[PDB]
Design a protein around this ligand. Sequence first.
Ligand code: NDG
Ligand code: NDG
Ligand code: MG
Lengths: 731, 746
Amino acid sequence: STGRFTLPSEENFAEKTKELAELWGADAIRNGKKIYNAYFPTRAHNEWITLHMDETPQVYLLTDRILAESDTVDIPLMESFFAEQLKPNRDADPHKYWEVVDRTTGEVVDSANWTLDADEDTVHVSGVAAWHEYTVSFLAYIIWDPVEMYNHLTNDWGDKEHEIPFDIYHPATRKFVFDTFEQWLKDSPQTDVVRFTTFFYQFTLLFDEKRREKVVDWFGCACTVSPRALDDFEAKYGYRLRPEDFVDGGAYNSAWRVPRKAQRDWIDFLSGFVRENVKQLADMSHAAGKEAMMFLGDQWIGTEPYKDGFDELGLDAVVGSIGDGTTTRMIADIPGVKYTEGRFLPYFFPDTGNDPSIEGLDNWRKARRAILRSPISRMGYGGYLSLAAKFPKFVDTVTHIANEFRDIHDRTGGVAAEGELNVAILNSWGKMRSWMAFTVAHALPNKQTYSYYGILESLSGMRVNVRFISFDDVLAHGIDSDIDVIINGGPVDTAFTGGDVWTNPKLVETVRAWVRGGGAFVGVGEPSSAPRFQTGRFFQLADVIGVDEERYQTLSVDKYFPPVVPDHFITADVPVDPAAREAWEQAGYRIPLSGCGGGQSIKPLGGIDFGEPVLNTYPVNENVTLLRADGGQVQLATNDYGKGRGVYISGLPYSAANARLLERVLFYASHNEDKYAAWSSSNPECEVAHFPEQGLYCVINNTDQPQKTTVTLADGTTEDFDLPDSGIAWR
Amino acid sequence: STGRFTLPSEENFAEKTKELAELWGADAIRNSEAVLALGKKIYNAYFPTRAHNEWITLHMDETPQVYLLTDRILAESDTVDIPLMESFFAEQLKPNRDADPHKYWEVVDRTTGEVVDSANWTLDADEDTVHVSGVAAWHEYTVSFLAYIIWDPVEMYNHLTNDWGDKEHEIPFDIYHPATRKFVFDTFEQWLKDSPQTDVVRFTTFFYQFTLLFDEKRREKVVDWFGCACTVSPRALDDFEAKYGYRLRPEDFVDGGAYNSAWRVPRKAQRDWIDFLSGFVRENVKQLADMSHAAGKEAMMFLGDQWIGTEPYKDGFDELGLDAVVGSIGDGTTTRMIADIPGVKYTEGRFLPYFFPDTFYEGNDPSIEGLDNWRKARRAILRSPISRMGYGGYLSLAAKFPKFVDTVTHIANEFRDIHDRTGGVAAEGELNVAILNSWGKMRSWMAFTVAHALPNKQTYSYYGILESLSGMRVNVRFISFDDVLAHGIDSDIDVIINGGPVDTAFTGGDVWTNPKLVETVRAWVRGGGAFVGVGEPSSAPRFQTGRFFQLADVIGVDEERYQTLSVDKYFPPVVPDHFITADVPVDPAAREAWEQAGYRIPLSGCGGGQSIKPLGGIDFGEPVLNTYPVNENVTLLRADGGQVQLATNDYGKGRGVYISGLPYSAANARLLERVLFYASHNEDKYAAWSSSNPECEVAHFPEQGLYCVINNTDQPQKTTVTLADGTTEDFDLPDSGIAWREALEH
Ligand SMILES: CC(=O)N[C@@H]1[C@@H](O)[C@H](O)[C@@H](CO)O[C@@H]1O
Ligand SMILES: CC(=O)N[C@@H]1[C@@H](O)[C@H](O)[C@@H](CO)O[C@@H]1O
Ligand SMILES: [Mg+2]
């Protein structure tokens, strides 16, 4: 049990620093061991940026919609934005760089028809149509670094000076940053690892007039424009971006949107620029005898750790924030670095009286099921070490975790567990957004995302191989012959279902043919959906999965539901209260009634949490197998399709039960039922990792209980376990 | 107290007929001898397009026809075979082989939408199968083909439902064909002479049956009470082309599988077809009426069955000279369908239950349904009187239920008494409310219907708006977008309601991307109008990334469509004490739990201000997911489960209101009524002629110097009625009761 652990520094508590590093087998100290220093290339020099204020990052902002009540309207620029963070750019010619849109028609208002007030941040529009809504899209300087701003507001730093951010796209600021880092390196001989936190462009993070978050996209590049960059883009790509190409009608190019060419063009542009400079920073670091480590977050926009070429940056490490299985996978699967690191929870900060061991062991549980599938090299925590030395139950929690971690490494050699199936998530983005589907705010699923995010989180720690593919991959090269299951999920008209790509007959031909020949297709929520393309067919692959969504176009056609099959391989681990099942059996099915179809269960069978409902799903014919069809619509179904199978699930919030459901779905759909038993846990609360090349397996408790489970080995025999609080057994 | 009441009768029942006719004050008798002596008006049912197999079996290419769409068949190579009849009831439907399939049919690649070249497919000589070649593999294919209708849809329905098992299937006929038309008219002429004792010809109905197709399992496959599917023929299709200057594709009927549902945003081809069919139906209905009148008889049309093409709410209906319309009283809404029809001398309700062994069986109590049906109809009747009432089915069946019999005496007496007191004049409406959709007046009271009187999971959240309004103390009209675009909004309108799911006739679909529509409604609201939006009002997909409900600014709510998830949504605190919710039953245990849990703290990418626990108390039916307030100045009244159900917004002089759904109930009708008075800035007008208790309603008759208060339930209800002058009266109303009082005569 040696090393692989990163411990954060403390102001003066330099006494227990030697004792806790010895107790935890620590080999690195954050901020005779390895030393990490956080570097912040775009802030922490107000002495520079105040003298060149037009070199701050900038962003297109969309004003509120203003109603015109005659042929003129006044549109205030800053009324809905935090004036401490953002300020309208009056230097760059508004009539050149801004755009007033009539949102009612979609037409751009002619620049002869509007002016910027000389003394107020107000736009005067004349010659317009009464009773239309009008917005301005304008450039704004970001005069306060979004993350430092966030920490300021969160910790209430009061009147502490606001860090002004700068943009290395301007040659003067770029020269300053490199000169400074050179000097910094010279002045930092003790530092072993430069922890870049992060680089050049903050992810979209804008605040409103009430000091609240207004707009956030962990992947967003709102905060990446300036007049020079926009003009250079035109010179390089051969057309001019509209402000609309960034404000996106109010959507701000959310990753949920079906990606437009303009967005891809901008990503490529930004990425060439960011990557060359990151490499320069890594080179300088290495030339000084130091390692370069990137933080996966904050100013990470334009790095693209999952695009090809990332390796050529020559970064030594990626370090990332661990909130769960999915966010662990984001870090763990990154190619082209020497090692990876997770900053585990809880952070060492007062708001975590309480038993802090619980969060720490829990954060470790969501992460460890993922680490088993895709190991991370190192672990650690941030913050105030004095604040946690005070909690003796927690210190012992960490000693255990650091040792379990290394024991895992020492048993497995950092090798990943064996995957029993090959699963592909199919969406508009593919590999570049590996493990990043459905995310808005990092680690914060919500009402609108959690029914889909649950898919990734289920997969993150599952005994299968997961890969991320795009509709472009499938159209150019077909479906790789080693894939067992394809998954398509999300709401209609998103990047994650795909939108109008589904009206492209080549795509449909390719998937249909592959499933007919024995492939497996799993649709979640509104899979393969295309609005208005066919009057009687919303899910374009409805025939594959046996389920469509009624969109109020087909109410005249009676829908007939076949009887639900309660005893089935897929649902075999769902406990049902006998009295629930009894009620469901007793009430029976609806009798055909004019205009109402028939066969829908009068009472629900239940037992399963499906998240957000997809209303009026129905079976396409009576040969589709219904597994849950409660409340007059369909939540779970399966269909045979030539040699292959399609499955529908309306939604899938993460839980052990739901992860087991999905796993069973994956083995069933790819006709691999008899392959399921080997290396399985009978208890859904527990999970098995098989390491054949080492002749070993482990079984883990996903919880802080005692859990009883039977593991089935490949040779048919069974081994029983009684697992203590988040335990781990090895055979 | 006698009259306005139609009595069913049968053979060998002269004595009970006589007694019950006397008991109920019946002035008319419906056929199904000695009974003829009584001096009552005599109704006889007539069925123009059936009951004559001896003719039609000799002229089988003159049965009505319909375009049918086969199942989607997957091609797995460059050829594919399509069974025409495997999803259809072969006892009802037969592919039409006589009329050139290559002229009249279409094979469609559903995966591309492309019509398959007529050269690339053949109809098998021996099997009902189409063979197709030169197709793309992995695409889905269908055939749209003409089928003869060989069994009368309604007679069939009844046969299957009543287990008639054995008897001959009645075959329908289509009068578009000159020979069949002549048969029908010669036969009606002969019948009139053979029926001197008949006073009222009760046409059940006319020429074209509403869409009603069955599947290979003898179940209903496709129904639309306003549907035009069963109305085609090669001749008619060809005549249409000549008249309108373009050929209808089979697609113009099958509609991708929708079959032209009234819920579909109407296409020009649909409207042309109606106009075409209606000219022809109306000319021939008129002849029947004229022949009836010349024989000294009245002509009465059943609002149902073969009524397609009569268009009772379209202009000109009065020119048919029909004396009466009769319809099934299923509820308030279906009562209004009948009552509001202009162009006839009188209207008639056929009440429930029907005298049949499915409800008149030992152990059942039909008087409960009988009185229930009366209650539901009576609240609508006060707003729009119908002239007459009656029952159908077997009298000898109802005669065995003395409790039921005594309930009828009560209903008959009450019906007549409401008529005598009000003189058949509508109660005074307190606001003018306009329902706005693609159809307008021609579908007055017909919005949200699929099968008649059968609201379901998909429709009840919107049908509830009509049922609420059907008996409400307001004037209700139905207007179209075309009316609005041509003439603006009539100045007498207080409130406009726009309701339904996105991309339907009822919300309006892309009409909402028409600047002029948006201009007109906005300016009218700003100048003091009221806009009430239900479900997905003013919704237009894709048009604006950041705006789904085009009038979100008016009503203060939009729906998140996963395009705007980077924008945090901030909900202002809910206001539980409001005019609109004033009559909602309080659950202090719900209210205190709600207050206790409080509101979500702003969280990154999750917005904030959403109540952590539901307030509840109101059934809004089907959820509209992820509705949210557009700004923090919108008034949230219900916003449970991280989305919005009920909200109001000030818009200049006027107001908008959002409601996610509205299943009918006393509580919900009262909530709507309150929405209407509030949104029109008419709170001060609300009290006058109102019942404190939502289970009761008030009808005012200024010109008779009367008001009445009615109990809409079978329980006793006490209520306090506020009069115009501010004075009040208390009432203890019995089970289903009515009370009358004097008011100031105007
Ligand atoms: C990995 C990552 O980008 N983390 C950031 C964090 O630095 C920041 O404080 C927060 C603001 O809400 O957003 C994200 O959680
Ligand atoms: C008013 C009207 O057209 N009623 C018909 C009824 O005659 C028929 O028996 C039924 C079949 O489902 O459909 C409708 O209810
Ligand atoms: Mg001025």
